[PDB]
Amino acid sequence: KLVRLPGLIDVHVHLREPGGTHKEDFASGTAAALAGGITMVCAMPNTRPPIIDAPALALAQKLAEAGARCDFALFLGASSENAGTLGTVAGSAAGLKLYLNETASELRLDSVVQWMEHFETWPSHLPIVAHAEQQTVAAVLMVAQLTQRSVHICHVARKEEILLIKAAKARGLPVTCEVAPHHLFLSHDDLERLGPGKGEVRPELGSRQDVEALWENMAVIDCFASDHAPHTLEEKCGSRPPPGFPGLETMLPLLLTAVSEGRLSLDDLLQRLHHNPRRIFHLPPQEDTYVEVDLEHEWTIPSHMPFSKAHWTPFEGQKVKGTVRRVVLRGEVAYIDGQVLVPPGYGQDVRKWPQGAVPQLP
């Protein structure tokens, strides 16, 4: 007996197109999404060129419309040069992404004043998400308060960070957050197996105490999101390993395993992969869209999942229970048992749907 889930939403994926298409492209990354039970993705702007301007957004929109197999929204990225310039296109994006720690010269911000300027100029009704680790979480929360608006913290990975966010929520501050599966299911204990290259990720893997703190504070976590960050094995194992793990194909099986073990409920999962992504990002419903999962099937994660061009996974060897059997997207069979059945270009930009605009005062 299968369980029918709604179309799940991953608000944090790196699909690498334009400019990194040996790692992933819209077609391969959205195949990976569908195979993971994900019907809508929000794609990050650290591509080449980075999505930091209207022309780059226009290019990425067309590449996504032509290549995506599931529905999507595209983030804009904050730069040291673009505050006050994005107003015309801001509503067409998933939101604005701030990279507040290590990143590419183009998304690097030199000063908290630049964070301020983005919070002051980006339309106040539209989402802002931040890569903000350790004290940076507190710093960006201060900027959000000074500018009297909300912020969403990406991939919370540490006891320190979840407890800070917990304290902020207890004070009534408008902050939400997400957690990625590697920070719930991997830790320092796995670095020996992974090695120092494969194990490179930002935020880094936490201690067992970090992992246990995230589980104990599940009530504080608004969303799960993969931070699908594909790189090839050659890159991960080479001289200057880039940080990041592929994760679209493994996120739901890992979480279903936890549900079957009673570590969280089905509802907890659906708040975090459906309802809360919708409401934080004002993402529209997908008509006639659902995911059928088999909760009894036990399997072991292999050395690579079928669809991501990363062609490796840090979860290799973990035993999971639960698997995606079928995905229907807007009335068409999109995935069955290891085969994607919608072509590149089937997916659509949800921000162009009438129901997909973020409401605002006139």
Ligand X SMILES: O=C1C[C@@H](C(=O)O)NC(=O)N1
Q: How far is the CB of 33 from ligand X (least distance, A)?
A: 16
Q: Which pairing describes strands 332-336 and 38-43: parallel, antiparallel, or unpaired?
A: unpaired
Asked whether residue 188 is marked as a ligand-binding residue, the answer is no
Closest CA to 131 of 234, 1, 229: 229
Does residue number 154 form part of the binding site for Zn ion (CB under 5 A)? yes
Between 227 and 249, whose beta carbon lies closer to Zn ion?
A: 227
Question: Does the annotation count 227 as an active-site position?
Answer: yes
Q: How far is the CB of 166 from its own copies (least distance, A)?
A: 8
Between 54 and 173, whose beta carbon lies closer to its own copies?
A: 173
Q: Could you tell me which residues are beta bridge partners of residue 99?
A: 131
Asked whether residue 169 is marked as a ligand-binding residue, the answer is no
Between 154 and 256, whose beta carbon lies closer to ligand X?
A: 154
Please report, for residues 162, 166, 203, 221, the alpha-carbon distance to residue 216 in angstroms, rounded to integers and kept in the order given.
Answer: 10, 12, 19, 10
Please report, as a single letter, which amino acid is at residue 98: L
Q: Which pairing describes strands 332-336 and 319-329: parallel, antiparallel, or unpaired?
A: antiparallel
Chain-centre distance of CA 60, in angstroms? 17
Asked whether residue 101 is marked as a ligand-binding residue, the answer is no
Which option in ligand X, Zn ion, its own copies, none does residue 243 bind, with CB closer than 5 to 8 A by kind?
ligand X
Catalytic residue among 10, 25, 227, 349: 227
Q: How far is the CB of 221 from ligand X (least distance, A)?
A: 18
Please report, for residues 27, 34, 69, 310, the alpha-carbon distance to residue 307 in angstroms, rounded to integers and kept in the order given.
Answer: 10, 10, 12, 9
Between 147 and 226, whose beta carbon lies closer to ligand X?
A: 226
Contact (CB, 8 A) for 91 and 281: no
Contact (CB, 8 A) for 243 and 133: no
Positions in the binding site for its own copies (CB under 8 A): 1, 3-6, 125, 169-170, 172-174, 217-220, 259, 265-267, 270-271, 275-276, 278-279, 285, 287, 290, 295, 354-355, 357, 359-362
Binding site for Zn(2+): what residues are annotated?
12, 14, 97, 131, 154-155, 178, 227
Catalytic positions: 227
Binding site for (S)-dihydroorotate: what residues are annotated?
16, 46, 202, 231, 243
